[PDB]
mmCIF file of all heavy atoms in Angstrom:
data_model
loop_
_atom_site.group_PDB
_atom_site.id
_atom_site.type_symbol
_atom_site.label_atom_id
_atom_site.label_comp_id
_atom_site.label_asym_id
_atom_site.label_seq_id
_atom_site.Cartn_x
_atom_site.Cartn_y
_atom_site.Cartn_z
ATOM 1 N N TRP I 252 39.774 -7.860 -42.898
ATOM 2 C CA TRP I 252 39.272 -9.062 -43.410
ATOM 3 C C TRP I 252 39.007 -10.090 -42.295
ATOM 4 O O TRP I 252 37.968 -10.762 -42.318
ATOM 5 C CB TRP I 252 40.106 -9.800 -44.373
ATOM 6 C CG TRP I 252 39.586 -10.919 -45.116
ATOM 7 C CD1 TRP I 252 39.949 -12.180 -45.019
ATOM 8 C CD2 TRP I 252 38.650 -10.847 -46.141
ATOM 9 N NE1 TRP I 252 39.212 -13.030 -45.886
ATOM 10 C CE2 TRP I 252 38.401 -12.213 -46.575
ATOM 11 C CE3 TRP I 252 37.780 -9.818 -46.723
ATOM 12 C CZ2 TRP I 252 37.485 -12.589 -47.591
ATOM 13 C CZ3 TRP I 252 36.937 -10.257 -47.712
ATOM 14 C CH2 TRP I 252 36.746 -11.511 -48.184
ATOM 15 N N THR I 253 39.954 -10.182 -41.330
ATOM 16 C CA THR I 253 39.810 -11.362 -40.358
ATOM 17 C C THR I 253 39.337 -10.839 -39.006
ATOM 18 O O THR I 253 39.149 -11.758 -38.148
ATOM 19 C CB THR I 253 41.285 -11.878 -40.189
ATOM 20 O OG1 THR I 253 42.136 -10.884 -39.659
ATOM 21 C CG2 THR I 253 41.941 -12.521 -41.499
ATOM 22 N N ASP I 290 36.647 -0.460 -40.393
ATOM 23 C CA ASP I 290 36.937 -1.333 -41.550
ATOM 24 C C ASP I 290 36.067 -2.641 -41.395
ATOM 25 O O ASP I 290 36.562 -3.759 -41.076
ATOM 26 C CB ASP I 290 38.354 -1.565 -41.848
ATOM 27 C CG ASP I 290 38.642 -2.521 -43.057
ATOM 28 O OD1 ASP I 290 37.695 -2.737 -43.863
ATOM 29 O OD2 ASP I 290 39.795 -3.011 -43.027
ATOM 30 N N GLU I 292 34.076 -5.414 -42.860
ATOM 31 C CA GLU I 292 33.974 -6.115 -44.092
ATOM 32 C C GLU I 292 33.079 -7.309 -43.995
ATOM 33 O O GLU I 292 33.509 -8.478 -43.609
ATOM 34 C CB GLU I 292 35.412 -6.599 -44.532
ATOM 35 C CG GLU I 292 36.383 -5.416 -44.505
ATOM 36 C CD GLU I 292 37.743 -5.560 -45.154
ATOM 37 O OE1 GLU I 292 37.983 -6.681 -45.727
ATOM 38 O OE2 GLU I 292 38.507 -4.568 -45.320
ATOM 39 N N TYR I 367 40.116 -1.656 -55.113
ATOM 40 C CA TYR I 367 41.116 -2.701 -55.481
ATOM 41 C C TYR I 367 40.430 -4.062 -55.002
ATOM 42 O O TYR I 367 39.258 -4.120 -54.547
ATOM 43 C CB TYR I 367 42.471 -2.524 -54.809
ATOM 44 C CG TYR I 367 42.450 -1.843 -53.401
ATOM 45 C CD1 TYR I 367 42.043 -2.578 -52.359
ATOM 46 C CD2 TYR I 367 43.035 -0.612 -53.265
ATOM 47 C CE1 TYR I 367 42.099 -2.098 -51.040
ATOM 48 C CE2 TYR I 367 42.976 -0.082 -51.960
ATOM 49 C CZ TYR I 367 42.523 -0.798 -50.929
ATOM 50 O OH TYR I 367 42.579 -0.258 -49.614
ATOM 51 N N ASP I 368 41.099 -5.110 -55.270
ATOM 52 C CA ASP I 368 40.727 -6.486 -55.060
ATOM 53 C C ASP I 368 39.565 -6.830 -56.012
ATOM 54 O O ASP I 368 38.713 -7.680 -55.613
ATOM 55 C CB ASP I 368 40.341 -6.656 -53.573
ATOM 56 C CG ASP I 368 41.436 -6.325 -52.623
ATOM 57 O OD1 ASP I 368 42.597 -6.575 -52.919
ATOM 58 O OD2 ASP I 368 41.071 -5.846 -51.609
ATOM 59 N N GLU I 450 52.173 -14.203 -48.848
ATOM 60 C CA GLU I 450 51.040 -15.154 -48.936
ATOM 61 C C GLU I 450 50.608 -15.341 -50.321
ATOM 62 O O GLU I 450 50.786 -14.559 -51.254
ATOM 63 C CB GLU I 450 49.805 -14.746 -48.056
ATOM 64 C CG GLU I 450 49.176 -13.384 -48.609
ATOM 65 C CD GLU I 450 47.982 -12.901 -47.799
ATOM 66 O OE1 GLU I 450 46.962 -13.683 -47.981
ATOM 67 O OE2 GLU I 450 48.061 -11.924 -47.176
ATOM 68 N N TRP I 516 46.840 0.866 -49.625
ATOM 69 C CA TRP I 516 47.167 -0.252 -48.768
ATOM 70 C C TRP I 516 48.257 -1.191 -49.546
ATOM 71 O O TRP I 516 48.091 -1.438 -50.710
ATOM 72 C CB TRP I 516 45.901 -1.269 -48.791
ATOM 73 C CG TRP I 516 46.154 -2.480 -47.861
ATOM 74 C CD1 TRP I 516 46.689 -3.692 -48.234
ATOM 75 C CD2 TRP I 516 45.875 -2.618 -46.520
ATOM 76 N NE1 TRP I 516 46.759 -4.532 -47.135
ATOM 77 C CE2 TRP I 516 46.340 -3.868 -46.076
ATOM 78 C CE3 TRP I 516 45.310 -1.757 -45.512
ATOM 79 C CZ2 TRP I 516 46.139 -4.299 -44.727
ATOM 80 C CZ3 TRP I 516 45.058 -2.109 -44.287
ATOM 81 C CH2 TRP I 516 45.542 -3.444 -43.854
ATOM 82 N N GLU I 517 49.303 -1.513 -48.919
ATOM 83 C CA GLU I 517 49.698 -1.166 -47.609
ATOM 84 C C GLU I 517 51.129 -0.539 -47.602
ATOM 85 O O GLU I 517 51.740 -0.726 -48.606
ATOM 86 C CB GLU I 517 49.805 -2.279 -46.608
ATOM 87 C CG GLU I 517 50.322 -3.665 -47.166
ATOM 88 C CD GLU I 517 50.187 -4.715 -45.985
ATOM 89 O OE1 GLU I 517 51.183 -4.926 -45.172
ATOM 90 O OE2 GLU I 517 49.224 -5.478 -46.051
HETATM 91 C C1 LIG R 601 45.331 -9.655 -38.733
HETATM 92 C C2 LIG R 601 45.639 -10.707 -39.747
HETATM 93 O O1 LIG R 601 44.672 -11.555 -39.991
HETATM 94 N N1 LIG R 601 46.862 -10.691 -40.318
HETATM 95 C C3 LIG R 601 47.196 -11.687 -41.264
HETATM 96 C C4 LIG R 601 47.413 -11.120 -42.646
HETATM 97 O O2 LIG R 601 46.157 -10.893 -43.214
HETATM 98 C C5 LIG R 601 46.111 -9.578 -43.889
HETATM 99 C C6 LIG R 601 46.505 -9.782 -45.303
HETATM 100 O O3 LIG R 601 45.833 -10.904 -45.934
HETATM 101 C C7 LIG R 601 46.110 -8.576 -46.189
HETATM 102 N N2 LIG R 601 46.214 -8.886 -47.656
HETATM 103 C C8 LIG R 601 46.958 -7.977 -48.452
HETATM 104 C C9 LIG R 601 46.591 -7.762 -49.875
HETATM 105 O O4 LIG R 601 47.838 -7.220 -47.898
HETATM 106 C C10 LIG R 601 44.625 -8.143 -45.987
HETATM 107 O O5 LIG R 601 44.512 -6.824 -46.450
HETATM 108 C C11 LIG R 601 43.115 -6.366 -46.728
HETATM 109 C C12 LIG R 601 42.578 -5.699 -45.398
HETATM 110 O O6 LIG R 601 42.103 -6.616 -44.469
HETATM 111 C C13 LIG R 601 41.450 -4.869 -45.974
HETATM 112 N N3 LIG R 601 41.164 -3.628 -45.254
HETATM 113 C C14 LIG R 601 41.517 -2.557 -46.074
HETATM 114 N N4 LIG R 601 41.850 -1.353 -45.504
HETATM 115 C C15 LIG R 601 42.096 -0.269 -46.551
HETATM 116 C C16 LIG R 601 41.549 -0.837 -44.310
HETATM 117 O O7 LIG R 601 42.161 -3.015 -47.180
HETATM 118 C C17 LIG R 601 41.879 -4.379 -47.384
HETATM 119 C C18 LIG R 601 43.268 -5.118 -47.606
HETATM 120 C C19 LIG R 601 43.611 -5.349 -49.057
HETATM 121 O O8 LIG R 601 42.622 -6.207 -49.683
HETATM 122 O O9 LIG R 601 44.470 -7.921 -44.485
HETATM 123 C C20 LIG R 601 44.568 -9.191 -43.704
HETATM 124 C C21 LIG R 601 44.057 -8.947 -42.366
HETATM 125 O O10 LIG R 601 42.747 -8.486 -42.446
HETATM 126 O O11 LIG R 601 48.031 -12.036 -43.633
HETATM 127 C C22 LIG R 601 49.316 -12.454 -43.190
HETATM 128 C C23 LIG R 601 49.790 -13.413 -44.374
HETATM 129 O O12 LIG R 601 50.202 -12.522 -45.427
HETATM 130 C C24 LIG R 601 49.130 -13.280 -41.925
HETATM 131 O O13 LIG R 601 50.428 -13.737 -41.512
HETATM 132 C C25 LIG R 601 48.531 -12.340 -40.812
HETATM 133 O O14 LIG R 601 49.414 -11.277 -40.469
#
Side-chain angles (χ1 to χ4, degrees):
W252 188 251
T253 59
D290 179 13
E292 307 195 358
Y367 35 69
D368 305 322
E450 65 178 292
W516 181 277
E517 36 187 275

